[PDB]
């Protein structure tokens, strides 16, 4: 386990580099989340195909859409699958930001994700075994 | 609230696919 900020930073850096974008700022947690995120994306590629246009992302819409989506995602519960979806949704927001010539937003989204993990998911994560539990359920 | 409920449905289904034991 340890630090949510680093977990976010590493996840976002990886998702962006996959699209060839280099973003200026144990390891088993980072790798496991990468693997899970990639399988999530691989499986539900088609399902979220339209998403980037559904997002309709602008500097004025970004924070509101993030809140709306993340708050609704976890309204009636939390589980590791929903958390992986959360990370993937963030990744999509970042990729779309660069695409819509809003690359500075990437830093804001990383902050929003970090804050949300620290202030709203932290309790559930610790009560359910920490990132160590995630590693055992999802990783090698 | 689309995107969020259709992430949620699929997150839950995904968390199936990775059910304990």
DSSP code string of B1-21: -HHHHHHHHHHHHHHHHT---
Q: Which domain holds residue A45?
A: 1-140
Distance CA A55, CA A50 (A): 9
Distance CA A91, CA A18 (A): 11
Structure tokens belonging to residue A8: 């976010």
How remote is the C-alpha of A113 from its chain's centroid?
7
- Residue A28: half-sphere exposure toward Cβ, Cα within 13 Å: 12
Q: How far is CA A45 from the centre of its chain?
A: 16
- Burial class for A73, CB neighbours closer than 10 Å (0-12, 13-18, 19+): buried
d(CA A77, CA A57): 26
Q: What's the CA gap between B12 and A77, in Å, rounded? A: 10
Contact A43/B at CB under 8 A: yes
Q: Do A72 and B13 touch (CB under 8 A)?
A: no
Give CA A80 to chain center in angstroms.
12
Contact list in B for residue A87 (CB cut-off 8 A) is none
Q: Which position has the token pair 């696919």?
A: B17
- The Cα–Cα gap between A123 and A12 comes to 23
Method underlying the structure:
X-ray
For chain A, give the longest Cα–Cα distance.
41
User: In the numeric block, which tokens belong to residue A130?
Assistant: 């920490």
B21 CB within 8 Å of a chain A CB: no
How is residue B1 written in tokens?
A: 């609230």
Alpha helices in A44-104 (DSSP H): 51-55, 62-73, 80-99
Cα A136 to Cα A64, A66, A140, distances in angstroms: 34, 29, 7
Taking the C-alpha atoms of residue A91 and residue A66, their distance in angstroms, rounded to an integer, is 12
Of A44, A81, A85, the CB nearest to B18: A81
The total domain count for chain A is 1
The resolution in Å comes to 2.2
Burial class of A139 by CB neighbour count within 10 A (0 to 12, 13 to 18, 19+): middle
CA A58-A107-A59 angle, to 5 degrees, is 15
**Closest by Cα among A43, A127, A40 to A83:** A40
Residue pair B11/A79 in contact (Cβ under 8 Å)? The answer is: yes
The tokens for A139 are 């990783």
């Amino acid at each position: 386990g340890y630090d949510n900020r680093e977990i976010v930073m590493k996840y976002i850096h990886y998702k962006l580099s996959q699209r060839g974008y280099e973003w200026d700022a144990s390891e088993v947690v980072h790798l496991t989340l990468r693997q899970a995120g990639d399988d999530f994306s691989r499986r539900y590629r088609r399902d979220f195909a339209e998403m980037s246009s559904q997002l309709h992302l602008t500097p004025f819409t970004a924070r509101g859409r993030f809140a709306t989506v993340v708050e609704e995602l976890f309204r009636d519960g939390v589980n590791w699958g929903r958390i992986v979806a959360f990370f993937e949704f963030g990744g999509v927001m970042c990729v779309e930001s660069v695409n819509r010539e809003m690359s500075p937003l990437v830093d804001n989204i990383a902050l929003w994700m970090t804050e949300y993990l620290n202030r709203h998911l932290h309790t559930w994560i610790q009560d359910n075994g920490g990132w160590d539990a995630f590693v055992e359920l999802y990783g090698p | 609230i689309x995107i969020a409920q259709x992430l949620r449905x699929i997150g839950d289904x995904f968390n199936x696919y990775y059910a304990r034991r």
